[PDB]
Amino acid sequence: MEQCGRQAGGALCPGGLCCSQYGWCANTPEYCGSGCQSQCDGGV
Secondary structure, eight states, rough: OOOOOOGGTTOOOOGOEOOTTSSBBOOOOHHTTTOOOBBBOOOO
């Protein structure tokens, strides 16, 4: 799992993954919902 956002110098997730409020990359509501830092729409 890649890191992102505040927790990784502002980095975007690879492969259209959502960056959670904790700075981890995945595509579940826990990552793409409230607090999502980037690519919250899956990179559409």
